[PDB]
Write an enzyme that holds these catalytic residues in place. Sequence first.
Site, PDB file in Angstrom:
ATOM      1  N   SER A 130       0.822  -1.107   0.070  1.00  0.00           N
ATOM      2  CA  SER A 130      -0.119   0.215  -0.138  1.00  0.00           C
ATOM      3  C   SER A 130       0.779   1.355  -0.171  1.00  0.00           C
ATOM      4  O   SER A 130       0.185   2.436  -0.044  1.00  0.00           O
ATOM      5  CB  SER A 130      -1.150   0.039   0.910  1.00  0.00           C
ATOM      6  OG  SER A 130      -2.165  -0.842   0.727  1.00  0.00           O
TER       7      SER A 130
ATOM      8  N   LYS B  94       3.168   6.898   4.561  1.00  0.00           N
ATOM      9  CA  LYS B  94       2.219   5.741   4.305  1.00  0.00           C
ATOM     10  C   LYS B  94       2.798   4.628   4.925  1.00  0.00           C
ATOM     11  O   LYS B  94       3.830   4.009   4.650  1.00  0.00           O
ATOM     12  CB  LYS B  94       1.965   5.898   2.766  1.00  0.00           C
ATOM     13  CG  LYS B  94       1.082   4.681   2.281  1.00  0.00           C
ATOM     14  CD  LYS B  94      -0.323   5.322   2.303  1.00  0.00           C
ATOM     15  CE  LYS B  94      -1.631   4.344   2.217  1.00  0.00           C
ATOM     16  NZ  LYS B  94      -1.417   3.325   3.352  1.00  0.00           N
ATOM     17  N   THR B  95       1.891   3.730   5.283  1.00  0.00           N
ATOM     18  CA  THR B  95       2.066   2.348   6.098  1.00  0.00           C
ATOM     19  C   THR B  95       1.836   1.324   4.673  1.00  0.00           C
ATOM     20  O   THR B  95       0.919   1.720   3.951  1.00  0.00           O
ATOM     21  CB  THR B  95       1.368   1.949   7.057  1.00  0.00           C
ATOM     22  OG1 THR B  95      -0.092   1.963   6.694  1.00  0.00           O
ATOM     23  CG2 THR B  95       1.665   2.625   8.240  1.00  0.00           C
ATOM     24  N   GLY B  96       2.493   0.226   4.783  1.00  0.00           N
ATOM     25  CA  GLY B  96       2.239  -0.737   3.675  1.00  0.00           C
ATOM     26  C   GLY B  96       2.520  -2.191   4.240  1.00  0.00           C
ATOM     27  O   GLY B  96       3.331  -2.265   5.132  1.00  0.00           O
TER      28      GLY B  96
END
Lengths: 242, 242
Positions: free
Chosen positions: A28, A174-176
Amino acid sequence: TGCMLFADGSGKPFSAQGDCASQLPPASTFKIPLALMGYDSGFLVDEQLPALPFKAGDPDFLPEWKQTTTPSRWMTYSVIWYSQRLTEWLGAARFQQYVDRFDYGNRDLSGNPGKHDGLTQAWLSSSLAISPQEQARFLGKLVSGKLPVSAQTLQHTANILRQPDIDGWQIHGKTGTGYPKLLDGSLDRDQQIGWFVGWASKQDQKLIFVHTVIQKPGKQFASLRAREEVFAALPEQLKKLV
Amino acid sequence: TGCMLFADGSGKPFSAQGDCASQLPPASTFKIPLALMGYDSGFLVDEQLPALPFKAGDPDFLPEWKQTTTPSRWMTYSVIWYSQRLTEWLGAARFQQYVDRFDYGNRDLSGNPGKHDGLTQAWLSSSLAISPQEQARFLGKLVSGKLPVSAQTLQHTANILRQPDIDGWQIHGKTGTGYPKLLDGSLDRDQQIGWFVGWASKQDQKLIFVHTVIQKPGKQFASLRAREEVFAALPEQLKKLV
């Protein structure tokens, strides 16, 4: 094979610790280049628009995906179906043009073998892979005005990606969460990759940061342990920067 | 019984149609004076802070209330437990001082009869009541700098209360869902009240708006029919204003 990398404005790393050069699924975090594609092309209007509805047949893995999502809600709950809506609208040709011009990692958008669903599944733990070094380089180009996008595309992308502050510093991140495509790193392992990528700004000064968490699933989400660790170790890097 | 009121900058109505003078429960629209109390006193830091966790024993009527809430998420999913956290912290004396200085409707924060829980339940279809006229007057004071709060309290309140734009104008608004008294001591008539209150802005030019929807309950809330009707009928009022 976890990694904590801190880079300057241009995207040049000055502190890298762990596996900072191995290519991993972006998961993501690919929502960052997607927010730019979406604002540059005109698919995404602003933070509120378009408010696209959920349809029967769309992935419903997380309950927060089940309603009308906006670009702000897209980034927040990592709504994958909203990313597919954008890519289907762009077309595979424009998608590839953007991934090439952005020099995004391995640039492989062929997807899973056989079923040629690269358009909606490339970043979803398959063909596409980016190294923490490459991620910092990419982030450094969007923060330096080096990518072929407008100021307002960069500002809308920033807004939907904004995180809680640290003193006078503005945090964007942003996290993924993804798994290495079968064995594309160091054999079959079934290990989660947490990502917390982004930058921090305070007028002139800017600072890129990339962090990965490699763990067996359990109790804590890999990417939420990444976000936590960045916010812990960030003020010293900011202080070092000033 | 329903009402469509449009007021100018000062909060002076220029178009009022229906029951614009009757006092009704403010419901979640009381989260506007609460956002000001919270920012003025220092309970609320900004749009992201504080991120308060959900605790066992907190009202869980809506599923979106079940997680960690920020002031931005508070306004969106009308998280009542986050409002109680704020009021318990302010104290009943400061709460009353603010409601008095804000001249908010009937200013009755005694709550339900017997129960004594006015601090956390006054706006929740009980003692407190505001008329659409009074709401416009209140909104007009916060938009004119007439309330005893800072610029940054007004800006943080604006940010968390922001809505999609209209042709260059900036929309700030809040939905509310309550019930009137059926006269049986303190009953509930079962005439669900929807609210869509707020203001529009384009540089110097500002415009207040208040709308109520009175309907027998259904699958969806009365306040979403209010928000819809305001966004339909607003461009003409903005055009009339210019």
